[PDB]
Paper text:
Though the catalytic mechanism of OXA-48 is known, the molecular origin of its biphasic kinetics has been elusive. The partial inactivation of several OXA carbapenemases during turnover has been observed in the literature. It has been proposed that it is a result of the decarbamylation of the N-carbamylated catalytic lysine residue (KCX), which acts as a general base and is critical for the acylation and deacylation steps of the reaction. Our data and analysis thereof show that chloride ion acts as a Janus effector: it delivers allosteric activation by binding at the dimeric enzyme interface while independently causing the inhibition of steady-state catalytic activity by misorientation of a reactive intermediate by ion pairing with R250 in the active site.
We added 500 mM NaBr and 32 mM imipenem to the apo OXA-48WT crystal and observed a clear Br– anomalous signal overlapping with the density of imipenem, indicating that Br– and imipenem compete for binding to R250 (1.53 Å resolution). R250 has been proposed to play an important role in catalysis by binding to the carboxylate of the substrates. These data indicate that the binding of chloride to R250 is essential for chloride-induced biphasic kinetics. After supplementation of chloride, binding of chloride wedged between the imipenem intermediate and R250 results in progressive rate retardation from the accumulation of the inactive intermediate formed during catalysis until a new active–inactive equilibrium is established to deliver the slower steady-state kinetics observed.
Author numbering:
A (entry chain BBB), B (entry chain AAA), D (entry chain CCC): 23 to 265
C (entry chain DDD): 18 to 265
The structure:
């Protein structure tokens, strides 16, 4: 059975007075698991999870030369302190530095952005709105199952952009590594249109398998942001994917 | 003297654990009063105070036919419940309905928007960024002192746009009226660049004088938004402008 | 509750608001969206009285349309004659003249308009019985002109919709000058009147309540033997508006 | 000052009843630090640290097609349980799977192995001994300072192999990652020729700097192997490189 619902994971959302969805994909078995098949297939603004395709396109087009190229702060103080400095691709993805990616999107332009998202089969492929803000308050929407389909292509270097572009973005996605697992992932927090949601999408590399994941959860305030990773890890532990 | 600093108004900011400026202009005496000349001249994003020039331009170019024309809710559920309904110019200005004004700005377009703000001598006249979001996160900046200069021209029908455009916007600015005074004004809340500030700009019509006002204050959360009107009214009452 | 399709529905319960103040009169309401009227007294709702200072609305419109008044800033110099109402004994503009019901300013407008244009304009406006018989500068106080509360509403609806046979500008300036009350829940544009020259002495308040998604037109009059009860015009109207859930 | 001696670091060695050297290189400042200048320049058998150059050569010559290619266990039960199974480049590096790298070395051959170590300026460049064991019991010798020189070239993609080969080996070196730092490194344990020593070589990636490191310590028994990483992290902590 390709897709199975496991409502026992709702206890992790309940425990934290939260509502949301975790989707897992066992790459070896080609099987999916979620607490909520309906919500797994509901589309939301990608917010900063869009930094994964945006990075790939920026690299492929040479808007980003490499992961060391410096993107100057515009000197506007914003409310995430780590944003108010020069960045490279690694630090811009680590700290979700929106203004750096807004500059990439302007240099990419609407025609190339649209073509690339169609070829990626990325969400509804709709860039309507401002080319520098559409993933925040424009027409683009993606479901957790659609995030998994896209991430599997990236994992296997199967996107049409260069192998090099794909390797550099996976390096930039690096979030955690230890003796048991590697996590490559991207957070997002969509606030400009309801419902306000938190994302975490990516994969867990084990010695002998890869588990893809995409989660979103209701996030009425920034107070709950750490629950994005905390709830995913509680599900990964329950399923014995990580110790 | 054209400008005088009255630091006693700081008592009103301090009582509300707040920081900001109130600027008053006595039209009859051509004299200004502020608690803080320095902050009175600091330029900030106008945010929803931009709905005053945006309304004028939209009416002058016929983007808005009249104050009854209905602008249909686009069906995207947003944060402010009153935005999720149809609006005319009157209700759109009352509830600060951004999406309505974003549509006005797109129809106006960057060339006419830029030229109109130059004719108005409006703040730094800089519309850099997205034509539909520059007053939220683009290049435009205006100080409390510069808001007064603009509002005086609107009050006297001295802006280059039609008298009709000016009359309809002043109708739309109506905020409060009783047997003692009329307030025409517009709130704003700038959150996308630091420092987050609240605005209230407009004027008090008396039988035999007009007092222009422009106030802004630090607004780290939405909890303090009522302080924009409350602190301004404390100053107006101290100065015997209103009971 | 009320019935659909009905033109005018009587609600005698509002008489309680008059009786409380040892008074009697009529409130008429018109729901613009629903095209339905309500009154405590179907007979008095339709009784035609001298308009007295409510005439300042059409008088204002005609004076502006003909250029007798240039704009709402033009100063009308006090003629030097000390009258009973202190607020009349000073310079006025259209805004302050309408707020303080400054009869002498409007008498001067009426003489400049003159009988032929005043008559033509009231016919174009379908205003009350359209009769200006009497002194060109006092007919709305002691001449032949008569208007009911329902006819005040008819006229006011045309003004609200800029449908009177004068410039849009004239209509916008007069609606500005009618501004009486505003807050985050409602706006009232209205004009008071006090007919004292011909019995029975009555008080008026006519205008409308602007809501986000509707307009409620109103016209009230009440017996007013002395100026002591003039504040009851607004007070009783607000009791009715509160009862009908039009204002909180 | 090219190299500074900091003997206060010896406290990390004595607290662990151990003797050895840590060498750090601050890439931004082009300055080195060590607890023992003379041992920093002492050349030892590289043992499994040789897996870094061997991986690069194997990739560039196509012995390894990519990091997914499976290297079938030869069926020989060996002392380290994790070696008794199939491996790819990632797991062969993680578990230091000598037999996989011995097969790489036979496929590379003496002539190409020699030319590549000359091209890399690697240690004494001397491969004399068994083509499949010279890094364990042959003539090759490298100091901690020479490990850092070699690693700086790999970090900057300056070795005379392709950018792709360098990017794949740096992926395979991934050891630890969190919100504070990333460590790419390789352990070694030289037991075949006295003196028995342990290695750890690699670097710490920070947001704004890279700290290269090479440590070796006396290792009479396998009981102290965890001290390779533990003593290095005690130094990084003392220098405020990691929290
Ligand atoms: C809020 C929005 O800018 C968000 C996004 O684009 O998804 C940024 C800010 C954040 S969380 C900071 C909280 N800010 C709330 N406005 C992240 C993240 O953690 O990935 N990305
Ligand atoms: C938030 C921003 O759009 C702001 C503006 O553009 O000035 C909106 C929201 C608000 S306050 C509503 C509560 N805050 C939500 N951001 C107002 C205002 O009062 O003028 N306008
Ligand atoms: C009395 C008459 O002039 C009257 C009118 O024209 O309607 C004036 C006086 C007044 S109230 C003054 C009370 N004394 C009246 N004699 C008003 C009003 O309330 O609109 N207007
Ligand atoms: Br392409
Ligand atoms: Br590559
Ligand atoms: Br990596
Ligand atoms: Br056009
Ligand atoms: Br001016
Ligand atoms: Br007009
Ligand atoms: Br008005
Ligand atoms: Br080892």
């Amino acid at each position: 059975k390709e897709w199975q619902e496991n409502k026992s994971w709702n206890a992790h959302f309940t425990e934290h007075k939260s509502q949301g969805v975790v989707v897992l994909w066992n790459e070896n078995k080609q099987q999916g698991f979620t607490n909520n098949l309906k919500r797994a297939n509901q589309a939301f603004l990608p917010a900063s999870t869009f930094k994964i395709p945006n990075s790939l396109i920026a690299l492929d087009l040479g808007v980003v030369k490499d992961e060391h190229q410096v993107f100057k702060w515009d000197g506007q103080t914003r409310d995430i302190a780590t944003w108010n400095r020069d960045h490279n691709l690694i630090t811009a993805m680590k700290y979700s530095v929106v203004p750096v990616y807004q500059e990439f999107a302007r240099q990419i332009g609407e025609a190339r952005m649209s073509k690339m998202l169609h070829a990626f089969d990325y969400g509804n492929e709709d860039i309507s709105g401002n080319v520098d803000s559409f993933w925040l308050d424009g027409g683009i929407r993606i479901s957790a199952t659609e995030q998994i389909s896209f991430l599997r292509k990236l994992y296997h270097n199967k996107l049409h952009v260069s192998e090099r572009s794909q390797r550099i973005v996976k390096q930039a996605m690096l979030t955690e590594a230890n003796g048991d697992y590697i996590i490559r992932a991207k957070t997002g927090y969509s606030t400009r249109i309801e419902p306000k949601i938190g994302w975490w999408v990516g994969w867990v590399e084990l010695d002998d398998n890869v588990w893809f994941f995409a989660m979103n959860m209701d996030m009425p305030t920034s107070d709950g942001l750490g629950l994005r990773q905390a709830i995913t890890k509680e599900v990964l532990k329950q399923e014995k994917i990580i110790p």
